[PDB]
Amino acid sequence: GVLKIVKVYLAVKRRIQPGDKMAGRHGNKGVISKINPIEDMPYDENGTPV
Amino acid sequence: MNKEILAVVEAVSNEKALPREKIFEALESALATATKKKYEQEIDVRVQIDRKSGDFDTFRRWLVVDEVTQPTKEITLEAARYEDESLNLGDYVEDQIESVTFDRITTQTAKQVIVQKVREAERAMVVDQFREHEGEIITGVV
Amino acid sequence: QDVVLGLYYMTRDCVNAKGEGMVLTGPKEAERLYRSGLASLHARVKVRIT
């Protein structure tokens, strides 16, 4: 007792935000807590921010 | 042709002396109207009124003219050269159609708008009634 | 955890730093000497505290 089935595929693009879980490959987990600007990052004596 | 509207045509308590055909046209736009802000610009009050049919499918228009107004309906003598000069000047030739909304199972398509259109028809009727007298020494109660 | 590391690095001492054995008229100019770049965070010093 069904006439027709309509299936629709939504394609969300989820970026990153404070609250996602990132982790390395050794057990160092962590909730990313603040997405800083570029300027606040510790840079070295070449210029590149970490 | 389910002869659904045919029986509804002659209801006709208060819509007997009134423009029966026009009322159906308004009802069709109310069902196909109401929530119709897509297509190209709006809806289409005008529609090929076929008594036998009953549910006159919403038909559009092209309105042959000679100017550059109302984009949707714009025809010219140079544009009518493809149809072997069959179009004249000032003709309301139709060359497009539209769509409705299910049948009677979808109440509110023309129900609020259907009553709205009915209301508009009633307003026109009241205007005609007041024009019949056109000012007289009548009384009334506050 | 982070805050006890910040305190344990702050209130400690080393046998030579910038401003070893200078004398300071209060804790306000102790922080002023740390911020301007004339002493170190752990450098033993006579202060006058109340």
């Binding site: - | 550059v68 984009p71 714009e74 010219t76 003598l77 140079e78 544009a79 009518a80 050269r81 493809y82 | -």
Partner: protein, 92 residues
């Protein structure tokens, strides 16, 4: 703030001129006009729409595309040029 501010006072128609092929419509709409040896839309504006409708090189869908292009009123507005150039279109 006065010190820091004193340390900084030593620092502080295009649619007709475009080609018919450059139009947003398909290549057929441009080729309908280009069949009469037209490369710029200024040449399309130099000729009347009635004169284009009297030639079967344009099609029925090409007429609708021409209407869609003329809806912006930048081309096919029934104008007359000297040959190509307006005064703003001057040689320098």
């Amino acid at each position: 703030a006065t010190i820091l501010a004193e340390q900084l006072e030593a620092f502080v128609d295009p649619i007709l001129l475009r080609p018919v092929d450059d139009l947003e419509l398909t290549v057929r709409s441009a080729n309908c006009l280009k069949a009469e040896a037209i490369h710029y839309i200024g040449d399309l504006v130099q000729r009347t729409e009635v004169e284009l409708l009297k030639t079967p090189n344009l099609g029925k869908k090409s007429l609708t595309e021409i209407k869609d292009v003329l809806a912006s009123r930048g081309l096919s507005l029934g104008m007359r040029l000297e040959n190509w150039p307006p005064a703003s279109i001057a040689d320098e």
